[PDB]
Amino acid sequence: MREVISIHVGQGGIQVGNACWELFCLEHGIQPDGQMPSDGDDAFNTFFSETGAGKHVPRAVFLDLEPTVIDEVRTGTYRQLFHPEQLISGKEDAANNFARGHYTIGKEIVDLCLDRIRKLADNCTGLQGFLVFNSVGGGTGSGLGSLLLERLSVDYGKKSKLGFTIYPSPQVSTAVVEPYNSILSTHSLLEHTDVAVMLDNEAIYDICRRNLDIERPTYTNLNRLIAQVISSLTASLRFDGALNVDITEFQTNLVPYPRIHFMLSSYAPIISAEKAYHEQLSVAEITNSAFEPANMMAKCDPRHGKYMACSMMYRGDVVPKDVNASIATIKTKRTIQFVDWCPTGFKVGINYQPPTVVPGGDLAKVMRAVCMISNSTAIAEVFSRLDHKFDLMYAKRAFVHWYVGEGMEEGEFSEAREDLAALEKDYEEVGIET
Amino acid sequence: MREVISIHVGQGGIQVGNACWELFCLEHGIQPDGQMPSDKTIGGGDDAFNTFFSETGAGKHVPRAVFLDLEPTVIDEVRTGTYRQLFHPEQLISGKEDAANNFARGHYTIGKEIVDLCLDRIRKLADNCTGLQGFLVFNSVGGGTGSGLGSLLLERLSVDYGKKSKLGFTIYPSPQVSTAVVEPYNSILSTHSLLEHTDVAVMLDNEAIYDICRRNLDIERPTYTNLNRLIAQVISSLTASLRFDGALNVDITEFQTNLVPYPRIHFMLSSYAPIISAEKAYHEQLSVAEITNSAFEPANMMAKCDPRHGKYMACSMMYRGDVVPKDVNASIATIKTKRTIQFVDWCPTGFKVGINYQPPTVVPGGDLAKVMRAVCMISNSTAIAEVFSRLDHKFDLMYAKRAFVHWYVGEGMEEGEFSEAREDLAALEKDYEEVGIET
Amino acid sequence: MREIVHIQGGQCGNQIGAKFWEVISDEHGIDPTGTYHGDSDLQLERINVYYNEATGGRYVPRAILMDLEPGTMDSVRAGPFGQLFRPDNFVFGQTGAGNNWAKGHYTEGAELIDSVLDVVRKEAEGCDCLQGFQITHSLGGGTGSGMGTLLISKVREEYPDRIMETFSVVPSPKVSDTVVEPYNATLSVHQLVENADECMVIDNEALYDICFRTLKLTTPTYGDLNHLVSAAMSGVTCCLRFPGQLNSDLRKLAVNLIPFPRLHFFMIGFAPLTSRGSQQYRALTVPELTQQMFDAKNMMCAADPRHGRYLTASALFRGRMSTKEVDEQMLNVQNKNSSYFVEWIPNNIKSSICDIPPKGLKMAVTFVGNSTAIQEMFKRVAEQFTAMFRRKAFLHWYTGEGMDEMEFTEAESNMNDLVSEYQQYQDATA
Amino acid sequence: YTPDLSASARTFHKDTIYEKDYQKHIPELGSKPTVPKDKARPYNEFTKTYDSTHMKIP
Amino acid sequence: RLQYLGDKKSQKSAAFFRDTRVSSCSYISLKGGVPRAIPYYGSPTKTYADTMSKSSYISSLNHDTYRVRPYQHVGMSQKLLEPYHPHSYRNRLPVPDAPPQFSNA
Numbered sequence A: 001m002r003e004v005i006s007i008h009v010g011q012g013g014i015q016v017g018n019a020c021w022e023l024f025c026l027e028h029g030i031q032p033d034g035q036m037p038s039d040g041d042d043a044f045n046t047f048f049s050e051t052g053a054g055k056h057v058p059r060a061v062f063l064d065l066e067p068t069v070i071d072e073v074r075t076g077t078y079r080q081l082f083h084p085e086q087l088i089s090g091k092e093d094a095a096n097n098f099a100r101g102h103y104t105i106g107k108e109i110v111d112l113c114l115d116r117i118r119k120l121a122d123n124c125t126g127l128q129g130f131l132v133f134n135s136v137g138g139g140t141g142s143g144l145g146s147l148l149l150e151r152l153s154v155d156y157g158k159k160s161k162l163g164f165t166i167y168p169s170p171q172v173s174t175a176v177v178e179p180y181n182s183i184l185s186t187h188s189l190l191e192h193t194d195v196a197v198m199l200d201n202e203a204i205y206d207i208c209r210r211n212l213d214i215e216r217p218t219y220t221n222l223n224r225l226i227a228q229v230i231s232s233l234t235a236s237l238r239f240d241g242a243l244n245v246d247i248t249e250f251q252t253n254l255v256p257y258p259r260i261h262f263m264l265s266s267y268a269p270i271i272s273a274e275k276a277y278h279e280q281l282s283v284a285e286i287t288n289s290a291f292e293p294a295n296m297m298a299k300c301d302p303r304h305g306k307y308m309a310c311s312m313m314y315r316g317d318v319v320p321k322d323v324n325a326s327i328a329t330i331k332t333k334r335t336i337q338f339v340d341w342c343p344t345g346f347k348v349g350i351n352y353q354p355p356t357v358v359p360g361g362d363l364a365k366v367m368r369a370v371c372m373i374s375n376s377t378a379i380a381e382v383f384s385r386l387d388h389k390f391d392l393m394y395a396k397r398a399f400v401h402w403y404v405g406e407g408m409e410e411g412e413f414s415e416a417r418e419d420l421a422a423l424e425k426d427y428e429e430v431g432i433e434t
Numbered sequence B: 001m002r003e004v005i006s007i008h009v010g011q012g013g014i015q016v017g018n019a020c021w022e023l024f025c026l027e028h029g030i031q032p033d034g035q036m037p038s039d040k041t042i043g044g045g046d047d048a049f050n051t052f053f054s055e056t057g058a059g060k061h062v063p064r065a066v067f068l069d070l071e072p073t074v075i076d077e078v079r080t081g082t083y084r085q086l087f088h089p090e091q092l093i094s095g096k097e098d099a100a101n102n103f104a105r106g107h108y109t110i111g112k113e114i115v116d117l118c119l120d121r122i123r124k125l126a127d128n129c130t131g132l133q134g135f136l137v138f139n140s141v142g143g144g145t146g147s148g149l150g151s152l153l154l155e156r157l158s159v160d161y162g163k164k165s166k167l168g169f170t171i172y173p174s175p176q177v178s179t180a181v182v183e184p185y186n187s188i189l190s191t192h193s194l195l196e197h198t199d200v201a202v203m204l205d206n207e208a209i210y211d212i213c214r215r216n217l218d219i220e221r222p223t224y225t226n227l228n229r230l231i232a233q234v235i236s237s238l239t240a241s242l243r244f245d246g247a248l249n250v251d252i253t254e255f256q257t258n259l260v261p262y263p264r265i266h267f268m269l270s271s272y273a274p275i276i277s278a279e280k281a282y283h284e285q286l287s288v289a290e291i292t293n294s295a296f297e298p299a300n301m302m303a304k305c306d307p308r309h310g311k312y313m314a315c316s317m318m319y320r321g322d323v324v325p326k327d328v329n330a331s332i333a334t335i336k337t338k339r340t341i342q343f344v345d346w347c348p349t350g351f352k353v354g355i356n357y358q359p360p361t362v363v364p365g366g367d368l369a370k371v372m373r374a375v376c377m378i379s380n381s382t383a384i385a386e387v388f389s390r391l392d393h394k395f396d397l398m399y400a401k402r403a404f405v406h407w408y409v410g411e412g413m414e415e416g417e418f419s420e421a422r423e424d425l426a427a428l429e430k431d432y433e434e435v436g437i438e439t
Numbered sequence C: 001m002r003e004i005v006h007i008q009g010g011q012c013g014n015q016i017g018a019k020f021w022e023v024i025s026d027e028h029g030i031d032p033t034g035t036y037h038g039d040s041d042l043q044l045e046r047i048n049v050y051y052n053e054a055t056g057g058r059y060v061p062r063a064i065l066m067d068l069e070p071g072t073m074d075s076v077r078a079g080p081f082g083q084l085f086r087p088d089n090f091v092f093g094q095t096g097a098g099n100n101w102a103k104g105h106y107t108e109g110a111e112l113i114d115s116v117l118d119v120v121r122k123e124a125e126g127c128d129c130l131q132g133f134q135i136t137h138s139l140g141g142g143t144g145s146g147m148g149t150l151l152i153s154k155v156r157e158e159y160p161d162r163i164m165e166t167f168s169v170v171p172s173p174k175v176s177d178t179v180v181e182p183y184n185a186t187l188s189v190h191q192l193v194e195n196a197d198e199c200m201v202i203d204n205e206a207l208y209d210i211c212f213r214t215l216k217l218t219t220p221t222y223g224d225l226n227h228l229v230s231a232a233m234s235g236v237t238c239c240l241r242f243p244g245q246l247n248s249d250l251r252k253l254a255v256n257l258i259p260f261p262r263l264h265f266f267m268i269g270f271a272p273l274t275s276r277g278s279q280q281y282r283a284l285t286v287p288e289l290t291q292q293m294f295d296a297k298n299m300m301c302a303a304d305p306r307h308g309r310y311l312t313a314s315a316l317f318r319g320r321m322s323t324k325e326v327d328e329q330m331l332n333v334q335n336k337n338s339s340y341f342v343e344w345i346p347n348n349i350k351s352s353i354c355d356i357p358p359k360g361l362k363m364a365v366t367f368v369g370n371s372t373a374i375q376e377m378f379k380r381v382a383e384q385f386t387a388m389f390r391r392k393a394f395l396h397w398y399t400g401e402g403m404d405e406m407e408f409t410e411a412e413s414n415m416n417d418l419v420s421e422y423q424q425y426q427d428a429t430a
Numbered sequence D: 001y002t003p004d005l006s007a008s009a010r011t012f013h014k015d016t017i018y019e020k021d022y023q024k025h026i027p028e029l030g031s032k033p034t035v036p037k038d039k040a041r042p043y044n045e046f047t048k049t050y051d052s053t054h055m056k057i058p
Numbered sequence E: 001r002l003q004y005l006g007d008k009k010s011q012k013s014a015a016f017f018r019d020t021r022v023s024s025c026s027y028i029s030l031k032g033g034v035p036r037a038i039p040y041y042g043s044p045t046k047t048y049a050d051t052m053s054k055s056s057y058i059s060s061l062n063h064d065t066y067r068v069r070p071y072q073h074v075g076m077s078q079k080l081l082e083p084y085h086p087h088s089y090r091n092r093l094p095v096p097d098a099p100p101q102f103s104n105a
């Protein structure tokens, strides 16, 4: 009776979502052409909507002002799955101009998208929430992604938000103008979303390299692991389990403060079959594996600062007694410390369905694993690094004009560093003892 | 009510002294002008800054320091420096002509015309003090002006005040690389006057600093300032107990009675570690023995000398922070047990332990920095007499040809005095050889 | 869908054009007759960008060939690939230019501007959403620089929003093909600063140096120089016609290549190049590609990028390569070549990914970078005028068009400080 | 004693289809997906949530 | 800008090389009646202010020597850039003191 509508925007968002849906699609036995072979079960409703004749139309929205990436899907094998008129594609791209994607070229399409999303909610009634994926270091996503973010808050209001962002790579970047469009995107999403994540692409490579030992990976595989991240997220929503964690039970157990809604997530284990033969893959050992910063999904070391929250969703064949026995072990180590006022911040959930592997995947088949979304003051560094960048290219007014001529006023830029400056102090003030 | 007066003569002291005072005012929260900001938490807690400063009654603070140098350029920099108001304008006595590394000028021809103002200066400075523990003198032996001003000045305080304890942190020339070409002469004669008129001598040869620098500091392009931020942090813990609470008080006075077994043997060397910095700060822990073990490491001494070549007579060590000393005995316990570390036959115990509570503060950010550990020794080893050999042999290497002889003879210093320095200096080795001989 | 147009003028501007359509016709699998015979279904999806639909299933380029002399346009159509261009789109008079910048802008070239402005407007109106104009011409020639620029100047008064390109072959002092080579280019150059959004400078010396040195060719012919310049063209819009992991239209490059609004003069380079006798003996892969592309000599500008510092740079890797390797080489090149990716804009290199390799090669890249090293070219090349101006004349061949002195003394007043704008943004620091 | 045999030497692989125990269970790329077994939330009472009888309450 | 331009005023001076058909540049100085001709495009010229031969430095050792050189450590937000070296100054493990216990004990 629970469904979630997904919003995938930005070249990554549709591409990053590209990999994830198959895992959503494959795990329910639905064929690529929208049919299931004759065989709880068949309650795909958690992501899909049965017409009544067999077809399963996902409740996802595709937006991009640039037809190219969009064109890759309707010409692909998955052409017959998605609803045809539900794929909104723009004519002229934003070309990485946040103002362009947020002031001039996106407004004329907002009504159509806002129209489509509203429709998809009519069929369902117990909608848990929405998942929106947008890359901060992207032009079209930065603006369009924000604008949709702003509207729903007045379109629905109180309804929660669960958005998966991908901040710029800590050191090896693709574009050059990312710091500008990155900050403003944060400003809009800073106080118009409920839960965020740290999806720096540098994290996957080392995880893909250290674990998968693939020194020449591409962007397609990176999404695969990210797709795995989501799968464990809704694991308790369409599978029987003794302890279940739902989206509506997120602000209660992961939001120490209304402002602070930016944490980092991770999953384990990333192991190919070639090394898992000589491995025990014991629940206890996997427990520490997702805590070492080497396996984290963000280029931040939690040893820099304290820990504010840690929520665990166990998926596979683990047993509660070992988890508590394993959970206690973490409270002994002195390399990782909590905050003075965080007596209880652990959340352990057990679901009976172990991971499912799509054909052609890199991860091998195992018996246990873990995914994590933890609250630690370590988030300070990532923004701090941006803070240094933001001023560097504005103290000489570099690239300012390109933004000014598309309708963005000059006074908008300052607040972004103003809001960010306040944000940094917000995290620091919640890391000291009383 | 305890006050200490630091005397600086020579550029090396002019610069090296700068690092300590700048950190001090940074340690005590003193602004460049010397005005303490009232906005800081609390303020005026007892008299902690009284050790180095002197209150004017309302406003700035006056550190008890004196600057001397014969060449204006060094002096002129301080007066126009960003801390041009931290020092008393009348305390910056400056001459007209440099000594240029010759003893006879700064001690017999032109150095005698300057001792008047400074000596009067300290008297006024000493008048303010009521519990003067002593005086601190910083200067480099590698110059006639230094040794010339050090030699002539120091003796005066011996008679002017008498029993007042005086500490001298000399900086001897390196074993192989020396700034000047006449480095041995000034050092060879310099030890003479200070031979019976200096209380403590801390072997701090520069090149050993780089070796530590080249092994821990890891700055392939260090500048003297890199050296300065090393020594300056050293003094902070040395007198640490003199300005902060400690379990077992360690004062300036109870050192000569702990580091002077014989009247002539008063040369000492010290060790301290670790270092704080900019590519080793996973800050995380390690334990004490590491700090103690590195303390006794042959390459960790502030001298290019190996205590493996000598024996240990007395020791003193200083810490800071807040833990239970109980590790000290065991940490020391692992020290003597080491076979590489040995004591003399007539030394039942040769360790002096003094620990304070104030942690280490660093300028932002230093060259050292806000280290987590702080272990420093005040101990003596016979090996330093050797590595006297470097100075002794090379000094011999020259006079045989009488090279550069006339330079000192041009100021009225007789040709015969050169003999005495060899005599007394030669006699210096005899006791060390006899001091280490077992009964 | 977001198609573009091309206006190439002047004999120099025409000859480069003669091959680009030769180059483009291959990529989309089109032979001279105008019929489709391609191989891959992706070959044809994005074909509308450069051609218009026509009866009989045949395609024609959206090109306007503009010249003032009769020989050139008479030359092209009778040669191979002579059928593609629409006959109507041609325009020419009966006078000619004669490398007289004066005649090409007031007397003769002015009177005919009606037709070219007549034809250009119509074709642009046809496209669903005009992406922009790319103008190729030789400022060293008469009609290109003289009359060609005006069309660049005029078109701004009608289409303020679209973006411009210029593949201008600025002549170099080493080997000058004309004595007028240094009263036609700049006077077209001066007007170029206030209207041209971007500028590509291709120096002849680079081509000959490029051909002799790496290609190891013995006796090249202009057919050799033309194609290498043309290959660069395919790189600019290459990602605009085929799908890829990371796409970037000609707009996206414009954002990440011009540090300040007016400093819009770049230098480009094409890699990889190897001789016929050397192909087998070289292992071609991603990491040695960077060595060639970032080498200064590979640049098509006579200026040496080692004379200055790079402001911003972009590279479009051609050939199917993963995402990891592309980024990492950037990190090392930035750190290793930090001295130049100067210091007040971190990571000034942009990245692009496309998955269609040039036919017959498995890895190649296209370079578009901004570096103050362009300052030398606007300092030395013909720098003699500053000393040679003092004597006031050659006038009688240019006042024949009403041009006065004030039009010249004013330009440096407007033109004095390009480097004095470029130079300043080379020593500044936070 | 000659070198034993070139064909029996250590070969980085041999002719045994699945040369190792590794790939015996590696998933087939083209295999059709299999519907999951009886492992999910058992469903009775929320039936009375989506029915068209809830509205019109008054 | 900078760039170049033409000259364009011919029938002006020198009275002889005027309209002498010969590609002879503009006209002939003859102010002194001696050598160098007018050295078709330039450079917007320069003045002493434009080229001042910037000094290698502007300041002295002590200013940097005693610079006002916060204490960086694990996290603590900004970290100043410095040359890379793997033997370590501020990214490695610390060591925390073994200090005393006050009072008579």
Ligand SMILES: Nc1nc2c(ncn2[C@@H]2O[C@H](COP(=O)(O)OP(=O)(O)OP(=O)(O)O)[C@@H](O)[C@H]2O)c(=O)[nH]1
Pocket (backbone or CB within 6 Å): A009, A010, A011, A012, A015, A016, A066, A093, A094, A095, A096, A097, A101, A135, A137, A138, A139, A140, A141, A142, A166, A167, A168, A169, A173, A174, A175, A200, A201, A219, A220, A222, A223, C245, C246, C247
């Ligand atoms: N981790 C990851 N990031 C991706 C992937 N594809 C694209 N990105 C992100 O996309 C950024 C590059 O900019 P674009 O993808 O062009 O941004 P955009 O979505 O096109 O936004 P617009 O330019 O306005 O159209 C990179 O910095 C990446 O962070 C991917 O496959 N994996």
Ligand SMILES: Nc1nc2c(ncn2[C@@H]2O[C@H](COP(=O)(O)OP(=O)(O)OP(=O)(O)O)[C@@H](O)[C@H]2O)c(=O)[nH]1
Pocket (backbone or CB within 6 Å): B010, B011, B012, B013, B015, B016, B070, B071, B098, B099, B100, B101, B140, B141, B142, B143, B144, B145, B146, B147, B171, B173, B178, B179, B180, B206, B224, B225, B227, B228
């Ligand atoms: N380690 C270290 N030594 C210094 C520093 N500044 C000066 N010195 C010492 O000063 C010595 C140079 O001798 P001189 O230049 O003759 O100085 P001087 O002894 O006062 O003699 P004059 O300069 O003529 O007045 C060097 O050998 C150093 O040991 C410094 O910043 N660090």
Ligand SMILES: Nc1nc2c(ncn2[C@@H]2O[C@H](COP(=O)(O)OP(=O)(O)O)[C@@H](O)[C@H]2O)c(=O)[nH]1
Pocket (backbone or CB within 6 Å): C009, C010, C011, C012, C013, C015, C016, C097, C098, C099, C138, C140, C141, C142, C143, C144, C169, C171, C176, C177, C178, C204, C207, C222, C225, C226
């Ligand atoms: N690279 C290259 N340069 C050319 C070509 N054709 C002409 N040029 C250059 O153009 C210059 C002469 O241009 P010009 O004939 O005055 O142009 P026009 O007045 O339009 O005919 C010469 O210096 C050549 O270097 C060509 O096909 N390739």
Ligand SMILES: [Mg+2]
Pocket (backbone or CB within 6 Å): A011, A066, A093, A094, A095, A139, A140, C247
């Ligand atoms: Mg895009």
Ligand SMILES: [Mg+2]
Pocket (backbone or CB within 6 Å): B011, B071, B098, B099, B100, B145
């Ligand atoms: Mg001197």
